[PDB]
Amino acid sequence: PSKLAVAVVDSSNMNRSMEAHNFLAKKGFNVRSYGTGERVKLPAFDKPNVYEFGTKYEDIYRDLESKDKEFYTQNGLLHMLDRNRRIKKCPERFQDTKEQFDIIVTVEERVYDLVVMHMESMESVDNRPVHVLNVDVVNNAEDALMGAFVITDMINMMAKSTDLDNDIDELIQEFEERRKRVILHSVLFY
């Protein structure tokens, strides 16, 4: 409805960012998503499924298919890869993008730190501020879905504001209260 450029950021750019990306896009928002990790990591505990950022979601689908089509059908990972391939081609890395946002939402504190470190590491040119918010989302299928509803709810509330900068601290404060959550909120510059 409103002209907010939003980004959702996680480790992977696979589960939690894509659940939120999906729901925000369906609400009509100019949304993009990214991962803060070095490489794309999917689920033995010491044996994960690793791929590069820039790898098509479809290539990851065919790789896990030919490895073991049955295991990744039972854990619903192929269902996730389905959703993501419909949203965009390949998962992207936040640290490499030249896109600018009004709001950035991270799904855990460790991601938040990564985003903030990165943004700060780059000298500001446009002098344009951006709000970085952290909403904790526990990394599993069920909680990534519930989390994506919260993030959507939070961005909807923020989209309603006629002056976001001037109202955002009050909005967060009362949102935190009503939803019994802690939203870390910082400001960074492009």
Partner: protein
């Protein structure tokens, strides 16, 4: 030697400038985007004659249009900075704008505009009257934006703080301990042949803006966003100009001991996490040598381990330390 390129480009923008007076504000922004990519990009020569066409749209009722004018004028000072006196008036005028969205965008653009404008004016050997006029508007822009730290809008205040950061950095001297930054410009880069202003007066202003930022940073009713922005701006200033390091470290020390009671528990965590990062950055600067133990004290208060802090301190040779240790002893007397 000639060709068709200029004439073919002029015919394209004449068409676009004619559509503007009868176009909807949404169509006006599309048209202006195309006119800027041509007139400041593909065929840069077309700048001077289509200037007034674009600058007239600074009076348009739609704020998006007004914001596009700012975007254009900011580009003009980047690629055709010789046109600076012919555009700078609209910028000072747009700082009196009614829409906060326009004010914020103008302050943002004034960062590059003031740097590019200051670089160009002190480069001129025989500066004219138009150069004195442009400098006077730049002086007023600084004062205008400086007043906006007491604006009622939080977003305006944030942008104003960020603008003031670049001014302090420009209007101070770099040294050996300054962070290596590509386009870095200091009062050392301002020539003695320049009549337009004096290095001492700019330094005096830079020191006054810093004093204002240091005081602002220490108030009890500051917003969490303004506080975070101010803290990071103070960090940029100290790492760029380590002469201000002691003052910034003291401000940080005072803040961590007296967090404004207007901050929420979340805001405190947010402020402290940002403060931690700024302190870590400053500890990497060679100019922080004298304040290494103070900074360590605060980082320990903010949860850093002994080994995390230790890894940040730059390695120095003993002769370098002795130079510094003895400079610190002579300055104390």
């Amino acid at each position: 030697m000639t060709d068709e390129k200029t004439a073919t480009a002029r015919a394209k923008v004449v068409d676009w400038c004619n559509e503007l007076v009868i176009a909807s504000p949404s169509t006006k922004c599309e048209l202006l985007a195309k006119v800027q990519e041509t007139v400041l990009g593909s065929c840069a020569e077309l700048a001077e004659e289509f200037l007034e066409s674009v600058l007239s749209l600074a009076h348009d009722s739609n704020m998006e249009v007004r914001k596009q004018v700012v975007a254009f004028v900011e580009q003009v000072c980047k690629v055709k900075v010789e046109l600076l006196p012919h555009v700078i008036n609209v910028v000072s005028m747009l700082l009196r704008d009614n829409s906060a969205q326009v004010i914020k965008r103008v302050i943002q653009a004034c960062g590059s505009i003031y740097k590019n404008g200051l670089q160009y004016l002190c480069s001129l050997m025989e500066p004219g009257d138009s150069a004195e006029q442009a400098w006077n508007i730049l002086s007023l822009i600084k004062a205008q934006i400086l007043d906006m730290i007491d604006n009622e809008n939080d977003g305006i205040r944030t942008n104003a703080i960020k603008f003031l950061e670049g001014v302090v950095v420009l209007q101070s001297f770099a040294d050996e301990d300054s962070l290596k930054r590509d386009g870095d410009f200091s009062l050392a880069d301002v020539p003695d042949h320049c009549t337009l202003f004096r290095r001492e007066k700019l330094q005096e202003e830079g020191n006054n803006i810093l004093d204002i930022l240091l005081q602002f940073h220490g108030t009890t009713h500051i917003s969490s966003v303004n506080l975070i922005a101010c803290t990071s701006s103070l960090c940029t200033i100290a790492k760029m100009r380590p002469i201000f390091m002691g003052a910034v470290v003291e401000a940080f020390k005072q803040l961590n001991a007296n967090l404004p009671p207007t901050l929420t528990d979340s805001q405190v965590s947010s402020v402290r996490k940002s403060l931690k990062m700024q302190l870590q950055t400053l500890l990497k600067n060679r100019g922080a040598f004298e304040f290494a133990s103070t900074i360590r004290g605060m980082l320990v208060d903010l949860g850093s381990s002994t080994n995390e802090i230790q890894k940040l301190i730059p390695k120095m040779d003993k002769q370098e330390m002795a130079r510094r240790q003895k400079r610190i002893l002579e300055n104390a007397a």
